[PDB]
Design a binder for this molecule. Structure first.
Ligand code: DOB
Ligand code: DOB
Ligand code: CL
Ligand code: ZN
Ligand code: ZN
Ligand code: ZN
Ligand code: ZN
Lengths: 314, 313, 312, 313
C-alpha cells in the first residue's frame, strides 16, 4: 500500500520527454502523506503542460515543488533541444543539492536525453560523474551500486581499464565503498547487512597462489571492517560467493564482476544507484521516449518501483 | 464492461517496439470471449518476449494467433532494425488480407517505425498507401477518415499540395470518398449516417462568388449521392457545418479542413482509419516508443480505445 | 473595470437591435467607463431605444456624435435604404474617429446587408468598408478571429482557394503578421508567441507536398524572426492549433482559421485591422425580429467591449 | 577605496554591455575590494566579456556564482528570450543572497525589457521583481532615487496620479519611510533627518487645497515622531527641497521625486529598489545592444553605484 517512508527529491528529467508526465502519474498513485514526502525539481511550466495533457491539474496544488531548469520558451514535447538538456541537468543538480544539504534523504532522476545535454555544451557521461561534479568530489569517491533480483552489488571501481582499476585499488578504497554501500543499505531497509567481498584475483588469489593483490588489499580491508563491527565474509571468488546467494550486499572489485550477475538475472528491471557523501541518486532505468511525449502512453511503473526502492522502511 | 462485439485482426507492429507489449496488456483487459474475437498477427517470438517482461505467460494460451513477420534471429527490444521493419509490414499485410478475405471485419495496426521500414528497402508513406498496395488499388481509392470527439471526417484528398489536390478533385473522387466512408459508418455502428460535404472554397464558393470549383465538383457529387438515396447536406462552409454538430460524417476536400477540428478537440483521442474495399485499418496514433520498449512501462489505453471504436454493433 | 482605453461604438442599423444593445451595454458599465465610449449614430434612434427600454437618464451621461441621421421616425424591424445609409454613415464616423486618433478602436453594432444594398452602397464586409474609408487596398486589411482564447489572423479571406494561392507572397504574409502583432498589443498581449500555418499539409513537409511553403511561409518566418518576433513555423495548422500554446496564429486560408474558432466558440469576435484601426463586429445579426421590444441581450456587445478594452 | 561592505553584482543581460561593464568596474578596484563583490551570472558571458576587454587575468580571482546559465553560446547584441531569462535568474540569485544575509546589497547591471518580455516573464521594474522574489506585495517595495546629495523615496511610482492618490494611506507612507530609513543606514547616514512632501501644493495649506494631507501625511508624521523618528512636514515639496537640510525626502508622487533628481543630476542618478532588508540598485543606463561586443562601454555609472551602496559607516 504505502511505498514512501522518507523524504525524496524527484528531478523530472528532460522537460520535453516523458519525465514530467510519469512524475505526475507516480505522484497520483501515492497517498497524500506520501506526496508530501516527495519534493519535485523542474520547470513548473513542464509540469503544467504535462498536467493539462493528462487531465491531472487537481494534483498540482498538492505538490511540493522547487523551480529548477526553467525554460525561456514553452515546452515542446518530443523535441530534442539544448534548452531541455540544460533544464535536465539544472533540475538534477538542484535535487542533488537538496540531498546534500539534508533536506531530502535520496534523489530520483527521471529520464534525461544525452543528445539534448550534449547539444547544450554540457559534458555528461552518467549519474555517477554528474553526482561527483556536483558534490565537489573525485569520481572514485562516488560508487555505483546495482540492485536487482535480490542482489545488491557496489563497485569499488567502475568505468576504467582493468589495469587502471587494479592500480587504484587499496585497502582504504575498498573500505570507502563498503561504508558508502552499508549506509545505502540502511536507506534500502537493511540496517545490519551480511556483506561478501569479491576477490580481486580468481578464487580471491587462493591464498597468494594467483597474485598478491588480495593479501595486500581485500584481506586487510575485511579485517578492518570486522574490527569496526561489520558482518563481512571474504574475500572469496566472486563466482563462488554469488552462487551461495546468502548475502545482502556484495562488494565487487571490477565493473564486470558486478554487472554480469545483475544484467543476467534482472535484464529488464534493475536500479543503478550512485552513492556519494550522504547522497543516493537513482535513475528510472529507461529513456526519455521523445516520440510518445505528451501522447499519454507512458506509465510510471519503473519510477514507482524506484521510489519503493529508495523509499523503504527502516 | 465489454468492448469487442466483432472479429478484429490485431497486427502487433514493430516487434522491437511497444506494440507486442501493449497488444498483451489490451488482451489482458478483455474477457475470454472478447480475446477469441481478436486474432493477433505477428511473430510468436515477440509475444513470448513481451509476455516474459510483463509476467503474462498465462495469457499466451488463450490467444488466437497467426504467425506473420517471423524473425530469423531473437527480438532485440529498442533497436531499429530492417528485420523489424519487414516484420511490421508482413504482420499488417497478413492482418489486411484476413480482413479482405472476410476472416475479420477490421484491422488494428500497432505502432510501426518508419526508419525500420525504410531501412528494409520498403517504400512506406502511411497506412493508406500500404493498404492500397496490398489490396491492388490506386492510392486515391483508399481514403483516410479521422475519428474523435464525436467527429468522423473522411478526406477526398490527403498529403499533397493544395494546387495538386485541386487538380485532382473531381465529382467521381468525392463520390468514392463518401461511398467508402458510408460503408465504414456501418462498421462503426451508424447504419444510416447524416453526411455533410465541405466546400472546396470558403462558404462552399458562396453562390460561386468565391470560385467555380464547388459548382464543378462538390455540387454535382452531392446531387449524385442524393439520387442514390443518401442523406447528404451541402456543400457548406466547413467552419459553418462543423459548428452545427449534427452530422455523423463530414467529407473534407483538403487535409487541413478535416485535421484541424479533430486534433484541436481530441489531440490524443484521434483514430486514423484507412478505408479501402471492405477493409478498415486503424492505427494506434502513437509511435513505437523505442526508448521504453521491453521496460514494461507502456500503456495500452490508446489501443483499448481503438478496439472500442472498431468493436461495436 | 473592463474599459481601459477609448472606444468608438457605432450603433449599426438604427432599425435593428444595435441602438438598444448600445444602451444596455453602457448601462452595465460604471460612469468612468461610459465616458471612455463615444457613441456614433442618429440621436433619434438612441432616443427611440431609450424610451422603449426606460433608460432616458443614461442618454445625458453619454458621449455622442451624430452620424447617419434619419429622415423619418424609427421603424423597428423594417428594412429601409435609409437605415442602410445610416449604418454605413455611423460606422464611417466611428472609423474616422479611430483614424484621427480620437478613439483607440471601433466596435460596430450589427448591420443589415439588404438595407445597405438597397441604399445603393456596395458592401462586402467590414474589411471592405474599412479599406474604402481609409483609402487602402482591400488586401491590406486583414481579419483576425478571437474566441475561446484563440486569436487567428487570415493572410487571405473570401476568395477561392486557387485565387488565394495565386495571391500569396512573402510580403503579404508579413503584412498580415505586422497588422496582427500591433492588434495583439491592443488586446493586452504586447509580445505574443506566434505560430504560422503552412499553406500545404504539414507545411509542405520540406518540399514533399509542394513548393509553396519553401517559397512563401519559410522566407516570411525568417524575416519576422530576424526583426525580433517570437514565431514558430510554418507548421501543419492541425498540429500547432492542437497544442494551444500560442497567442496568435496566422492562417493562410479562410477555412484554416474559421473551423477552429467556430467549433470552439458558438460567439467569436471578428476584428478588421487596417492602418492603425481595429474594428470589431458583435458577431451576430441585426436581429430584426426582436428589435424594439426592449428584450435584447447586450452580452455579446459587453464581451466585445471587454476584448477591445483590455488592460495594457 | 569605495567598497566597504559585501555586494552582489548581477551582470544583467548576458548579451548586452552588463558583463563588460562588470569586468571594467571590478578591474578598477583593488584585489581586497574585488573579493567583497560576488558576481552572479553565466560564466560564459564573463568569458566572452573577458576576451573583448582583455581582462582574462581578472577571472580567476573573481568571486562568482553561476546563475542564468545559457544553453547556447553568447551572441552579443542579440535580443533573445534566453538572455531575458538569464537576466532575471541572475538578479533573482543576487537578491536571494541579500535576503539570506550573504551580501548587504545588490547591484543589477542593465537588463533588456524586450528580452525579458519575450521570455514570458512579467517585468515592470526592479520593485516588481523584488516583490515577487521576496514574497511581498508590490506596494511594500519602494524606489529611492539618489543623486546630487538628494535622497528621495517614493510612496507611489509608475501609476496614474489618480490611481496613486487612491492608494495613498497613513500606513503606506509609514512603510515607505521605514524602508527608506533602513536604507539610509546602508548609505552611511544611520539616523537621518526626514522631510515628508505634501500630497497637495503647500501640503494642502491646512485643508484649503484638499483634505488628503490632513488624512494621510499629517497622521503618518505624528505616528513616526511617536515611534521616535526625526521627521518634519508635511510641507510643500518645492519649499522643503529648497531648504536643503534633510538627509531623506519622502515623495508622495513619482514626479515630485523625479524632477529634482533629474534636474540636478541628469546623467548620474541611482535608483534603489528597497524591500525587506534588500537594497537593489540599477546602473541607470540601458543594455546598449548596439555596442555590445565592441568593448567601448563606460563603467563609470556602475562604479558610482558601487561607491554609493558600498559606503563607509
Ligand atoms: O555498464 C553499464 O550498463 C552502466 C551504465 C550506467 C552506469 O552508471 C553504470 C554502468 O555500469
Ligand atoms: O522612471 C525612471 O527613471 C526609472 C528608471 C528605472 C527604475 O528602476 C525606476 C524608475 O523610476
Ligand atoms: Cl483548407
Ligand atoms: Zn558500465
Ligand atoms: Zn496528415
Ligand atoms: Zn467567412
Ligand atoms: Zn519613472
Amino acid at each position: 500500500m504505502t511505498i514512501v517512508h522518507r523524504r525524496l527529491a524527484l528531478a523530472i528529467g528532460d522537460p520535453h520527454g516523458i519525465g514530467p508526465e510519469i512524475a505526475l502519474k507516480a505522484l497520483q498513485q501515492l497517498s497524500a502523506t506520501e506526496r508530501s514526502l516527495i519534493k519535485v525539481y523542474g520547470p513548473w511550466s513542464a509540469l503544467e503542460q504535462a498536467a493539462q495533457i493528462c487531465q491531472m491539474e487537481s494534483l498540482l496544488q498538492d505538490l511540493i515543488h522547487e523551480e529548477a531548469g526553467s525554460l525561456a520558451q514553452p515546452v515542446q514535447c518530443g523535441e530534442i533541444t539544448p534548452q531541455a538538456g540544460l533544464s535536465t541537468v539544472q533540475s538534477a543538480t538542484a535535487a542533488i543539492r537538496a540531498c546534500e544539504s539534508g533536506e531530502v534523504d535520496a534523489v530520483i532522476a527521471c529520464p534525461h536525453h544525452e543528445t539534448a545535454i550534449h547539444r547544450a555544451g554540457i559534458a555528461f557521461s552518467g549519474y555517477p560523474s554528474l553526482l561527483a561534479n556536483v558534490l565537489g568530489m573525485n569520481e572514485d569517491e562516488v560508487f555505483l551500486m546495482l540492485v536487482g533480483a535480490g542482489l545488491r552489488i557496489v563497485h569499488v571501481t567502475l568505468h576504467e581499464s582493468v589495469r587502471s582499476a587494479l592500480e587504484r585499488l587499496s585497502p582504504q578504497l575498498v573500505i570507502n565503498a563498503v561504508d558508502a554501500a552499508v549506509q545505502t543499505c540502511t536507506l534500502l531497509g537493511v540496517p545490519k547487512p551480511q556483506v561478501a567481498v569479491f576477490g580481486i584475483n580468481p578464487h580471491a588469489s587462493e591464498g597468494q597462489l594467483f597474485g598478491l593483490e588480495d593479501s595486500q588489499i581485500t584481506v586487510p580491508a575485511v579485517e578492518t571492517l570486522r574490527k569496526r563491527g561489520l558482518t563481512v565474509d571474504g574475500p572469496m571468488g566472486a563466482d563462488m560467493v554469488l552462487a551461495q546467494r546468502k548475502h545482502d550486499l556484495y562488494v565487487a572489485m571490477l565493473h564486470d564482476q558486478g554487472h554480469i550477475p545483475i544484467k543476467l538475472l534482472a535484464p529488464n528491471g534493475a536500479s543503478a544507484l550512485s552513492i556519494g557523501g550522504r547522497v543516493v541518486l537513482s535513475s528510472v532505468g529507461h529513456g526519455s521516449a521523445m516520440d510518445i511525449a505528451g501522447r499519454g502512453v507512458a506509465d510510471a511503473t519503473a519510477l514507482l518501483r524506484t521510489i519503493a526502492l529508495l523509499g523503504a522502511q527502516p
